[PDB]
Design a protein around this nucleic acid. Structure first.
Ligand SMILES: Nc1ncnc2c1ncn2[C@@H]1O[C@H](COP(=O)(O)OP(=O)(O)OP(=O)(O)O)[C@@H](O)[C@H]1O
Ligand SMILES: Nc1ncnc2c1ncn2[C@@H]1O[C@H](COP(=O)(O)OP(=O)(O)O)[C@@H](O)[C@H]1O
Lengths: 179, 150, 571, 114, 493, 195
DNA sequence: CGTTTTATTTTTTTTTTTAAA
């Protein structure tokens, strides 16, 4: 439960990017990567583009859920989210941070992007105050993950469970109740 | 030896004045070798935390805020009742108390108050709630930088 | 939808809403957007904004906005609701219902500068609050049986000839069968607020002018008199015309005031390092006599006898009993003497050093609107926790000298102008100051300083007299205690360097902890009945040494201070 | 959990799977510091009957860390070991619980954690 | 008959009428055989919400219309059980039992039945208002009828107008009275209880026939009400709260025939003088035995077809400085018995010629201060200094105890059974018999039996009583304290 | 009274919060010298035939137990409470830089201290390698640069730097020809705005 | 064979009257 705990995680994901110099002073780091050639895109984890874009080395354009129309349609797809909805990579609220930090110095339209995603994040979390006004009666055996994303549940992780324990002291005897 | 507590000298030391069925012998701390059936007998808990509740020494009795007279309407008045800091151990008296008085009736009440918090702290965006309250503020205050360096 | 300019919609159509949805820079913090969320931490139903962020977008709305905000701020209302009500649920599955809102704006000006030209216009000025009314009423709509439509209103006529008890065949119903039905209504607040101009803009040869104000919903219960304001309003009207020709309406309303935080006074209405400041000095058991040169922190007097203040400001203890009485936790002390001793300015400072008022005699002391008889009250106003120190007891009318006898020995208060009985009391006290007859030559002899009663010399304690005693040794010193003390007018800062004779504000809150903990007590233990009845100062020292308890005669230190007084009434 | 973990170790001598040695050298380091500092807290007239490493001291018998479950198994209702209701499992959803009841699937690593 | 839930809402109160609470506790033989006929039942919301919580909300958002309904269900119940308590067909209002400061009625609670506590004040004029019109057609002789309404009762009004005539044809048309009934109406206002104040803001209420002035300006109460406001602001607005019950807090008694049985049995302990004398002021030697009758007022005596003799007692005595912290233990506890300022007038019993208040006024501020203690008692200080004008106005009283002044105001006579005390100061100190008793005070002996004693109060500081004074007065000062908070119980001694 | 006195201990850490000049061992002294004095209170009827084991010393036997009870666990705290903030700085440094004072050392606190410093020894043998390396965990995670340039700080204090340097004067401008081998000590105890 | 009715408050100077050590 942290700001960079996810960033120990989410940037592990890997996507096709462009390098604009070829293989480095060494040729290839062994691992899933293949070596590098300018003008030839390469898929990598995303904790190098730090050391490219801040290094003034090469560009990148994103995945396709990272665009306008698909998310300008998911904005109405989640009408079904009386449980949950479509999940484009389930971390588009963390990657977009570091993407839109330094990438959009050259990217088109980093804004409607930003607009909708904030227009999607908290609103999916309003669900998570409201659907909690459905939660009653010691429902340990009722919960919801079915298309939950990655970045949200931490924001309730520390609180209610460390409450619900010394509730759960009460959640055999005679007619009265017991804990 | 405990699910420990900050006030282990105010933890089991809040005091009640239960009456008496039978005689007494030599209280020691008090003005005492024999006293009456039925008396305002000040009783700070701990020695009677396991002192033979079934025995003919003491009776059904409550400090009456903890009696139904407040609380059994504080379950109907469970709507905007305030508690402040008053009788503090009020999520937790019964965690010991409830059967020990042996009026078999008030186990529901405290739960009935505090399970309300499943729909109190939506709008959140005693000496025990303090911890989780601090935490509730804190985690969001740092989720703030979970956005960015901000 | 006349979309050439002045359109009815653009704002709520796309624009101001989208400005809101554009107020967006990264960190994911730069928002005019989550503000109201943390307003919704309670249901505050408002929000604050600027007058120079629209300018960060454009130069076209700034001029268009400020002209007719009577329209724009409700356009903004509609944008607000129709945007924010999206937020109760992402998709249709949470809403009790929506509700109502507020929007709040933010170079100053004055009152003698704004006239016929400055009408229907928004302004920034600054003044000083005076008083204002209560919180009554106002709605937006309701309806009538006769037609049952929500009576749409332009401004916060009276249903002309159409009746609508009408379409029953013929049988008609002219001239208003309109019983207004408030059970269908809405509801708002009011205060009618007020200002006075500065003390800098020529009220001297002229008169200080002022005007009236007008508020709406949540901005009442915010402001009380004796405060200092900046504001934005409107120059608007109430009357009609063409009054030998047309004299008419001043007032303003509010939009978004911004008040002041004047420096260091207002721990009044709206740290632990300071507790470390507090306590490590009291760790030293050197406060009793150290602060006997502090209460007059910069000048001479009461020096070896100032120790007797240690009991009074902390006081004793209002130790109630099982029986009737509520004892005299309030207890009184005296001063008396001639002028020249700095006795005018010393107590002048004492108001600066908890809470009170200070002058003497007839100077505190026994409306044409909405037919209610106001009565602002008596003398416990600023003194019920506050205490006072004043001159001119006998130099005062004897009509307002019964109250003192009721006030003081008991707080035996009552009311009899109209037929109801204020049963008031207080934890208050007084000191007396003096320029009565013949001082030290009087005090040793008998009893005529006050020329009416022997009562006084009744329920008072230490008798410490102010003199200008001839002492040739001290003559030169107080001949030299007085020049540069006056001259350069310079004694401000270097009193605070002392160990514990310092820091008036820190002292204020030292004390307002010190007494303000509980009702501490004493231990087990010429000596007459009244002098005795000082027992309350037996109680004092546990706040002075900050004990729980103490015994009789270590605190008869005060008796060494009081036996000084006993020589006045020795025999 | 220096307190009663030694019960588990004297129950099972937990093998390379469960515990590790250096943890059990903390037993040395624990009793050394605690008793040889206690040697100057109360040892002048130390206890009379409960004199050793005392009876009442425990950190965490609560197996009650109420826990979120990473659904990454059989999307049909694979019903498995837990003392509360276990009906209706699936690869996304969850029936939230405490740790006391599933010491089973994560010893299998059948199930997972969020 | 709005949205047709109305009858169903009526049924839900009628559905209050089935088993042990209704069937055993509630009404029928709970009011009617105790024979009060007063429509008003006590409601207790926690029960109704335990049955029909939706209907516990049915008021709290719209209490405009629960009232014809409640009355309907009641007349159905009382009208389908008792035929005696049924020839009073009117609304027959009921209990309806959020306390906010009269300062915190803030646009809202409209439609809500909510509470505020405060002062009775400006208790005002009483005037009935009219319900129906029992109109007659004396040629055709048909007693026809026309009901009326106001917002102060419901939402609507009729064509509220002149009692009609010449309406049908011009036949014999005239009223009939004694049947066209009327409704006792009262108006007053309330203030916050002043101690909370930092101008404290008031409220305005309106009443009805069984709600009519249960106490007085100079009392205070908890009172529960709805809210409206009728006028049409800018086509200003001003409100009033209403739809009320009554309660009261500043009184004193779970005293049925048990507590009398309690008070009898301990009678026989003969020297209660001991107990009752050491009862209120153990915080004080000395008197308390003697105090007895200033509390008790006195006794009543009437001759057949003649006159009477006044009954109660008046005495006071002392060295300067126990006399101002003494006149207590009854000023607080005694029912409605008031000492006064000490040197006070404009209210002992005079008009005080000051016609700068309402521009007229004959009796407009004619009154005194002992009739508030009618069948009570009084004390004061500063008699030793007080004026001799109304000393005259005493000599009437201690002789008679009825006040009979007519300096053109009016030829008064008004009951009073009151007693009262005085002050002292020795104009020369410690002289009581060496000089003499009398006129070490600056006083008068015309008042021989006016007061009912010549008594004395004395002191000297001593050598022999020196440590006696020390050790007892401090025995007090530390039996003042606990174990002999800030102060627990002081037990021993 | 019977130990209501940790409520007094709370202010012993006041300046010693994150700006700790020095700490104090106090609040304890006769608080300890009572406890076995009142073993006499605890021993008085202890196995005495004054009553031969009957009613009137059961209820306050529990007191004798309660008195014990509150004794030991605050005595857990009295250093355990002190061992926590210790552990922060004591992860912020291995045995490089122990306490600034060691003046409020509850005299055999070294018993726990070294042992606690040596509970890490378990971890240490496994940490770094199977044989182990006292491993960098808390300090100078610069992506490290060349060894020999001087230093700037933000008024560190204690001057306890045991690392191979001539004299650094561990404050802001502890600035001498300082290699990396010296400067590997501390980061966030008043130090590192800057190099 | 139609289309309209209705409110005022504070200060003066005289002749009355009334206040304190
Ligand atoms: N026997 C006693 N019992 C109780 N209190 C006493 C006794 N003797 C003296 N005292 C205390 O001495 C004080 C004497 O001052 P006190 O307030 O009585 O002045 P006073 O008698 O009202 O003065 P004056 O009558 O001149 O106005 C009282 O407050 C009282 O509490
Ligand atoms: N010891 C002193 N220290 C400082 N100022 C003094 C002293 N004695 C007299 N004064 C002067 O006396 C003045 C106040 O005199 P004051 O008490 O008003 O006389 P009175 O009481 O007759 O009005 C102050 O301005 C102050 O300068």
């Amino acid at each position: 439960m942290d700001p960079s705990i996810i960033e120990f995680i989410g940037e592990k994901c890997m996507i096709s990017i462009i390098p604009n110099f070829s293989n480095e002073p060494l040729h290839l780091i062994y691992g899933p990567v293949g070596p590098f050639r300018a003008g030839f895109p390469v898929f990598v984890p995303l904790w190098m583009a730090t050391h490219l874009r801040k290094q003034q080395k090469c560009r990148i354009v994103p995945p396709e859920w990272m665009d306008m129309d698909i998310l300008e349609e998911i904005k109405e797809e989640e009408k079904r989210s009386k449980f949950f909805t479509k999940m484009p990579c389930e971390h588009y609220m963390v990657v977009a941070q570091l993407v839109m930090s330094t990438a959009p110095d050259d990217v088109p339209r980093c804004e409607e992007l930003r607009t909708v995603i904030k227009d999607i994040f908290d609103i999916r979390e309003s669900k998570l105050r409201t659907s909690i006004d459905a939660f009653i009666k010691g429902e340990g055996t009722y919960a919801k993950l079915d298309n939950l994303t990655l970045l949200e549940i931490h924001s309730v992780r520390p609180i209610l469970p460390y409450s619900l324990d010394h509730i759960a002291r009460y959640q055999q005897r005679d007619t009265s109740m017991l804990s | 030896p405990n699910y420990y507590s900050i006030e282990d000298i105010f933890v089991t030391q809040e005091k009640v004045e239960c009456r008496v069925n039978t005689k007494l012998q030599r209280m020691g701390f008090l003005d005492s070798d024999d006293l009456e059936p039925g008396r305002t007998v000040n009783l700070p808990l701990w020695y009677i935390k396991e002192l033979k509740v079934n025995n003919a020494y003491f009776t059904v009795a409550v400090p009456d805020i903890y009696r139904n007279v407040h609380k059994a309407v504080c379950e109907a008045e469970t709507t905007h009742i305030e508690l402040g800091r008053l009788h503090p151990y009020f999520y937790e008296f019964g965690r010991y108390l409830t059967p020990y008085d042996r009026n078999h009736v008030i186990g529901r009440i405290i739960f009935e108050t505090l399970r309300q918090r499943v729909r109190h702290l939506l709008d959140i965006s005693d000496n025990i709630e303090a911890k989780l309250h601090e935490a509730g503020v804190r985690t969001n205050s740092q989720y703030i930088e979970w956005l960015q360096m901000t | 939808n006349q979309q050439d300019a002045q359109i009815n919609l653009q704002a709520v159509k796309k624009k101001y809403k989208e400005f809101i949805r554009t107020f967006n820079e990264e960190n994911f913090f730069y928002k005019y957007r989550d503000t109201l969320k943390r307003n919704y931490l309670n249901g505050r139903y408002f929000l604050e904004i600027e007058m120079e962020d629209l300018v960060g977008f454009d130069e076209t709305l700034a001029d268009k906005l400020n002209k007719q905000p009577t329209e724009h701020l409700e356009i903004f209302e509609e944008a607000a609701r129709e945007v924010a009500d999206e937020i109760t649920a992402p998709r249709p599955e949470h809403e009790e219902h929506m509700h109502d809102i507020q929007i709040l704006l933010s170079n100053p000006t004055n009152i003698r500068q704004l006239k016929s030209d400055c009408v229907s216009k928004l302004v920034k000025i600054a003044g000083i609050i005076v008083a204002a009314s209560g919180i009554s009423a106002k709605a937006t709509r309701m309806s009538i049986q006769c037609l049952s439509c929500s009576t749409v209103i332009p401004n916060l006529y009276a249903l002309p000839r159409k009746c609508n008890t009408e379409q029953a065949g013929r049988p008609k119903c002219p001239l208003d069968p309109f019983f207004i039905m408030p059970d269908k209504c809405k509801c708002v607040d009011f205060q009618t607020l007020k200002l006075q101009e500065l003390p800098d803009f020529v009220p001297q040869g002229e008169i200080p002018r002022h005007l009236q104000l007008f508020c709406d919903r949540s901005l009442c219960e915010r402001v009380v008199p004796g405060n200092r304001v900046l504001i934005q309003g409107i120059y608007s009207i109430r009357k009609v015309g063409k009054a030998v020709v047309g004299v008419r309406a001043p007032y303003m309303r509010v939009v978004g005031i911004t008040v002041d935080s004047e420096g260091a006074g207002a721990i009044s209405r709206y740290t632990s390092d300071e507790e470390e400041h507090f306590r490590r000095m009291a760790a030293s058991g050197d406060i009793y006599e150290r602060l006997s040169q502090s209460l007059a922190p910069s000048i001479f007097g009461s020096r070896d006898i100032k120790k007797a203040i240690t009991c009074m400001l902390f006081g004793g203890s209002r130790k109630r009993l099982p029986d009737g009485l509520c004892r005299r936790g309030d207890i009184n002390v005296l001063l008396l003497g001639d002028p020249g001793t700095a006795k005018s300015q010393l107590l002048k400072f004492v108001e600066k050093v908890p809470i009170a008022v200070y002058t003497s005699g007839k100077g505190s002391s026994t409306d044409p609107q909405t037919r209610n008889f106001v009565m602002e009250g008596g003398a416990m106003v600023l003194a019920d926790g506050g205490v006072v120190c004043i001159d001119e007891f006998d130099k005062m009318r004897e009509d307002d000298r019964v109250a003192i006898h009721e006030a003081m020995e008991q707080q035996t208060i009552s009311i009899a102008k109209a037929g109801i009985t204020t049963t008031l009391n207080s934890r208050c006290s007084v000191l007396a100051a003096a320029n009565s007859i013949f001082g030290r030559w009087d005090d040793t002899k008998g009893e005529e300083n006050i020329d009416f009663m022997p009562t006084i010399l009744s329920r008072f304690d230490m008798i410490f007299i102010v003199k200008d005693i001839h002492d040739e040794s001290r003559d030169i010193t107080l001949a030299k205690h007085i020049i540069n003390v006056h001259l350069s007018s310079n004694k401000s800062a270097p009193s605070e360097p002392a160990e514990g004779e310092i820091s008036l504000s820190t002292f204020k809150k030292y004390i307002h902890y010190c007494r303000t903990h509980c009702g501490p007590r004493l231990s087990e233990a010429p000596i007459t009945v009244r002098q005795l009845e000082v027992i309350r100062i037996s109680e004092s020292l546990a706040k002075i040494r900050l004990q729980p308890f103490a015994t009789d005669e270590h605190v008869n230190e005060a008796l060494r201070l009081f036996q000084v007084s006993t020589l006045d009434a020795a025999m | 959990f220096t307190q009663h973990i030694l019960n588990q170790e004297e129950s099972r001598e937990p093998d390379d799977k469960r515990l590790s040695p250096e943890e059990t050298k903390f037993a040395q380091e624990f009793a050394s510091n605690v008793d040889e500092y206690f040697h100057k807290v109360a040892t002048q007239y130390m206890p009379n009957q409960q004199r050793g490493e005392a009876e009442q001291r425990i950190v965490t018998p609560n197996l009650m860390s109420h826990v979120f479950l990473k659904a990454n198994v059989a999307v049909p209702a694979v019903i498995v070991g837990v003392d509360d209701e276990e009906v209706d499992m699936a690869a996304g959803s969850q029936h939230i619980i405490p740790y006391q009841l599933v010491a089973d699937l994560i010893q299998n690593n059948q199930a997972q954690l969020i | 008959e709005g949205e047709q839930f109305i009858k169903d809402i009526q049924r839900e109160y009628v559905d209050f009428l089935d088993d042990e609470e209704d069937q055993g506790i509630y009404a029928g033989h709970v009011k009617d055989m105790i024979a009060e006929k007063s429509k008003r039942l006590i409601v207790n919301v926690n029960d109704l919400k335990r049955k029909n919580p939706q209907r516990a909300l049915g008021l709290l958002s719209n209490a405009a219309d629960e009232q014809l309904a409640f009355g309907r269900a009641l007349k159905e119940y009382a009208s389908t059980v008792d035929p005696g308590y049924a020839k009073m067909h009117e609304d027959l209002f009921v209990g309806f039992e959020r306390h906010v400061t009269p300062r915190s009625l803030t646009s809202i609670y409209l439609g809500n039945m909510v509470c505020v506590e405060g002062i009775v004040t400006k208790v005002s004029l009483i005037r009935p208002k009219v319900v129906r019109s029992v109109h007659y057609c004396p040629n055709t002789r048909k007693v026809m009828e026309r009901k009326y309404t106001d917002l102060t009762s419901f939402e609507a009004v009729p064509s509220g107008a002149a009692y009609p005539t010449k309406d049908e044809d011009g036949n014999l048309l005239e009223t009939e009275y004694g049947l066209s009934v009327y409704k006792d109406h009262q108006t007053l206002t309330i203030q916050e209880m002043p101690e909370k104040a930092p101008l404290p803001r008031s409220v305005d209420i309106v009443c009805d026939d069984d709600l009519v002035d249960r106490c007085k300006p100079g009392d205070r109460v908890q009172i529960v009400g709805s809210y409206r406001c009728l006028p049409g602001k800018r086509g200003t607005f001003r409100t009033v709260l209403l739809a009320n019950n009554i309660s009261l807090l500043s009184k004193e008694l779970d005293i049925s025939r048990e507590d009398i049985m309690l008070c009898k049995k301990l009678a026989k302990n003969n020297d209660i003088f001991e107990l009752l004398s050491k009862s209120l002021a153990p915080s004080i030697g000395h008197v308390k035995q003697a105090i007895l009758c200033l509390l008790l007022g006195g006794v009543e005596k009437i001759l057949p077809n003649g006159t009477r003799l006044r009954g109660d007692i008046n005495v006071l005595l002392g060295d300067p400085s126990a006399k101002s912290q003494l006149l207590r233990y009854v000023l607080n506890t005694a029912p409605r018995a008031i000492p006064t300022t000490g040197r006070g007038s404009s209210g002992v019993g005079l008009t005080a010629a000051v016609t700068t208040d309402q521009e007229t006024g004959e009796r407009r501020l004619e009154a005194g201060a002992m009739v508030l203690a009618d069948r009570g008692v009084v004390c004061i200080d500063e008699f030793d200094k007080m004026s001799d004008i109304d000393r005259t106005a005493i000599h009437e009283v201690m002789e008679q105890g009825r006040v009979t002044i007519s300096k053109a105001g009016i030829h008064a006579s008004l009951n009073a059974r009151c007693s009262v005390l005085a002050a002292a100061n020795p104009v020369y100190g410690r002289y009581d018999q060496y000089k003499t008793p009398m006129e070490n005070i600056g006083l008068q002996d015309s008042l021989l039996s006016r007061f009912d004693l010549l008594f004395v109060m004395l002191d000297v500081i001593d050598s022999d009583v020196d440590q006696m004074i020390s050790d007892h007065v401090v025995r007090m000062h530390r039996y003042r304290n606990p174990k002999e908070y800030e102060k627990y119980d002081a037990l021993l001694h | 009274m019977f130990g209501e006195k940790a409520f007094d201990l709370l202010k012993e850490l006041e300046r010693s919060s994150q700006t700790i000049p020095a700490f104090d061992d106090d609040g304890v002294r006769q608080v300890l010298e009572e406890i076995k004095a009142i073993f006499e209170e605890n021993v008085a009827q202890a196995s005495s035939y004054n009553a031969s084991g009957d009613r009137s010393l059961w209820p306050l036997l529990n007191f004798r137990h309660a008195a014990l009870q509150r004794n030991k666990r605050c005595l857990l705290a009295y250093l355990y409470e002190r061992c926590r903030r210790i552990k922060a700085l004591r992860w912020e440094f291995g045995p490089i830089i122990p306490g600034d004072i060691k003046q409020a050392l509850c005299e055999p606190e070294v018993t726990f201290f070294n042992n606690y410093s040596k509970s890490l020894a378990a971890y240490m043998c496994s940490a770094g390698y199977n044989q182990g390396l006292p491993i960098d965990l808390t300090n100078n995670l610069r992506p490290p640069k060349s060894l020999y340039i001087e230093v700037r700080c933000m008024e560190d204090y204690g001057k306890f730097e045991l690392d191979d340097g001539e004299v650094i004067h561990l404050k802001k401008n502890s600035q001498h020809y300082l290699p990396r081998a010296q400067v590997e000590s501390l980061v966030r105890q008043g130090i590192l705005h800057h190099i």
